[PDB]
């Protein structure tokens, strides 16, 4: 009833999301006759041939583009273009896709223990991280190379160091250090091997 050029009642808004989750750009639009509407990535037109699974809708003045499962490669600038006989209107926002990461954590900590000469001894931790943390064992400050002498072995996310038979020379301060690209952690405990009585 009033020939009016297209105008964004509310522009697109950039969004940060978790790789693997859904992302949605939303905008509200006005105009008359009602605008033709269309979407772009980095200047390129968007179709189900460029972005399989995309859900696009445009009704009641509200235009929506949704990506059910976003990948890293989807990052870029997104534009909604609205056209009509009296003019034209564009809105651009970014999509930033972040990968899962978590710093090393000890869900189960090394634990100080007292034992008898000639006992089998197991020091074990349970470590979580993303990416998977590199883990090392130490005694009195020096790193342990798994070997007959101290068998280090992983079983799921549970790491353990077996002392086949323990002797006083083995008493000391042990510790495990877990690191990855986003953080580090250390769990230290003590082992006391009792002597002859």
């Amino acid at each position: 009833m009033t020939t009016q050029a297209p105008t964004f009642t509310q522009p697109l808004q950039s969004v940060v999301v978790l790789e693997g989750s859904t992302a949605t750009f939303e905008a509200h639009i006005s105009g008359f006759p009602v605008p033709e509407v269309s979407w772009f990535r980095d200047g390129q037109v968007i179709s189900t041939s460029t972005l399989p699974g995309v859900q696009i809708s445009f009704s009641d003045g509200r235009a929506k583009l949704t990506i059910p499962a976003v990948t890293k490669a989807n990052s870029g600038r997104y534009s909604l273009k609205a056209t009509n006989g009296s003019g034209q209107a564009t809105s651009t926002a970014e999509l930033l896709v972040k990968a899962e990461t978590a710093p090393p954590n000890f869900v189960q900590r090394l634990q100080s223990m007292t034992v008898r000469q000639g006992s089998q001894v197991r020091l074990q931790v349970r470590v979580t991280g993303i990416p998977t943390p590199v883990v090392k064992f130490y005694r009195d400050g020096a790193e342990i190379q798994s070997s007959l002498d101290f068998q280090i072995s992983q079983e799921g996310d549970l790491y353990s160091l077996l002392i086949a038979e323990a002797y006083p020379e083995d008493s000391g301060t042990y510790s495990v250090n877990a690191t990855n690209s986003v953080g580090r952690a250390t769990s230290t405990a003590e082992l006391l091997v009792q002597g002859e009585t």
């Binding site: 105008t7 940060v16 926002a93 990461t101 978590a102 900590r109 634990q111 986003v182 580090r184 769990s187």
Partner: protein
């Protein structure tokens, strides 16, 4: 312009058992997108008027050893994800 990098630390010790524990990690990272990143621009060929606007937006991504992330644009709300991230 300049990404900010905030780190958190924990340090606990137990003298009854002679046990200790440390941790330090990249907790919160705040980045600044260039205004060209989110812009709007309108042309009215009937009334010969144009409008243009552009603005910076700062993104905030947080993480923790307890397997839980947080992210968003600062001004809008944050979203919380549960690491080992699934689907509903």
């Amino acid at each position: 312009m300049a990404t900010s990098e905030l780190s958190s630390e924990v340090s606990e010790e137990n003298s009854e058992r002679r046990e200790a524990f440390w941790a330090e990690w990249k907790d919160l990272t705040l980045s600044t997108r260039p205004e060209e990143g989110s812009s709007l621009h309108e042309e009215d060929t009937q009334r010969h008027e144009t409008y243009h606007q552009q603005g910076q937006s700062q993104v905030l991504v947080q993480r923790s050893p307890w397997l839980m992330m947080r992210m968003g644009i600062l001004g809008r709300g944050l979203q919380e994800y549960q690491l080992p991230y699934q689907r509903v």
